[PDB]
Design a protein around this ligand. Structure first.
Ligand SMILES: Nc1nc2ncc(CNc3ccc(C(=O)O)cc3)nc2c(=O)[nH]1
Ligand SMILES: Nc1nc2ncc(CNc3ccc(C(=O)O)cc3)nc2c(=O)[nH]1
Lengths: 255, 262
């Protein structure tokens, strides 16, 4: 099973794990984000993903660093930094972040070299909605190219995670196709992370217009993603996703 | 399966949702300004708005006269205010007959027509019937024992003149079953689907869900129940008996979208 060394905090993917979303978009903003990350840790998150973007590096650092510093001291959970900027990647890891969550899959100038030096795990996400002749084949080809580019830069394959990037330049039909064909992405030999949390495609499938109305559909999408091979799930609704996976694990355990 | 619920058709081309409507004073926040009937009707209407495919009305040891007093006015009001099929959750043939006369289109029987007169009552009514298993006792093989019991009740119903096409079966999750027995039955649910009759599963906010997730209160068991019901549908169940209708509907809709991909 994949064993991820998140700067000393081990994340073991022997079973699907839960990555709690901590959005940090001022002391009162930092305070709210830290309290939320603590709530998600109590709800059974296996990892916290800290994001301060959607902006200049120094602004992104002002938001993310105090949250990383406080959460690394107050929780024993691995911490992920959601950024595509190499200067943020280096500074966040210096602050205590144990993983890089990169929507740009190390395509920003200097990201490859920055991460090669850090020895933390890295999520290689797909983001190009454009027309796809075959979204599954195109996402697979892109992810192969990024795995190889990371390996050529000196990043050990065992530090890699991949992600189809649900909702990034993808129609509802493209997202459903990627979820249904998720086992094809699991053949790249690297753990797959799926993030469908309260996303527009969940809302379109269920007719739920607002993010918080999409919890039931998101918990179901994440259970299906885990059934189809995903080993990490990026969610807002930690306790609910934990309960869904626990029930499924009990059923799956029956010989 | 196409179930004719006294004129209201329930098509089981996909897993369907049976909304739980409990007609008991205890089931509602007793402020003291609403009647029990009024609260149960409003709840059944809310579940219909949430996308329930059928409502299951239950009044229950409850004396038969009190059971009738609870379920009948609720059935009369819901049959007029919704187009959904209505199930009556009862083991008493007097309630079965009266509920069908009031507008109920299905009988949901925890006793699988074992009460004296239930076989006769159902044979005459020509409405679908749920045959549930209820004996927690020690089981040498809970799956084999539940399967045998259900075979015997299907046979008994057919021998009484009840057309096989009007039957549904149900493993009775939580009825004389440990958490381990319930998990075993859910995991081995495809074995029950081999009997050629639609399978109903009800794990809604049940103690076993609470034990699996560490959720002490019924209302904290929603996520675990929605997951159990999705797994039951993946494993062959065509009907799901739930409190959390909108949430179960959303889970099944996402799964249907994924399943539809060739
Ligand atoms: N690795 C990873 N990181 C992410 N970071 C932010 C986000 C947030 N992105 C959005 C994209 C689309 C939508 C949408 O509503 O479709 C909402 C948020 N997603 C992910 C993701 O899925 N994977
Ligand atoms: N067909 C059918 N009807 C039912 N009626 C009442 C109930 C309520 N039964 C309970 C049994 C156990 C528990 C529990 O918490 O274990 C709660 C309710 N369940 C069903 C069911 O599963 N199937």
């Amino acid at each position: 099973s994949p064993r991820l060394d998140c700067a000393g905090r081990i994340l073991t993917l022997d079973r699907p794990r839960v990555m709690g979303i901590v959005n940090v978009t001022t002391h009162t903003t930092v305070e709210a984000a830290v309290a939320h990350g603590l709530r998600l840790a109590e709800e059974g998150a296996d990892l916290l993903d800290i994001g301060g973007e959607s902006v200049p590096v120094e602004e992104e650092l002002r938001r993310v660093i105090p949250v990383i510093e406080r959460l690394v001291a107050q929780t024993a959970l691995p911490l992920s930094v959601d950024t595509f900027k190499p200067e943020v990647m280096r500074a966040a890891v210096a602050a205590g972040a144990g993983m890089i969550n990169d929507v740009q899959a190390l395509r920003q100038p200097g990201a490859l070299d920055a991460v090669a030096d850090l020895r933390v795990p890295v999520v290689l996400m797909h983001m190009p909605a454009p027309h796809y002749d075959d979204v599954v084949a195109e996402v697979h080809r892109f992810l192969v190219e990024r795995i190889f580019a990371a390996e050529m830069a000196g990043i050990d394959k065992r530090r890699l995670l991949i992600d189809p990037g649900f909702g990034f330049g993808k129609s509802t039909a493209d997202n459903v196709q990627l979820l249904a064909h998720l086992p094809r992405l699991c053949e790249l030999g690297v753990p797959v992370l799926a993030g469908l949390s309260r996303k527009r495609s969940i809302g379109e499938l269920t007719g739920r217009e607002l993010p918080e109305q999409r919890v039931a559909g998101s918990v179901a999408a994440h259970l299906l993603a885990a059934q189809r091979g995903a080993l990490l799930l990026r969610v807002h609704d930690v306790a609910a996703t934990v309960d869904a996976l626990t029930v499924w694990q009990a059923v799956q355990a029956v010989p």
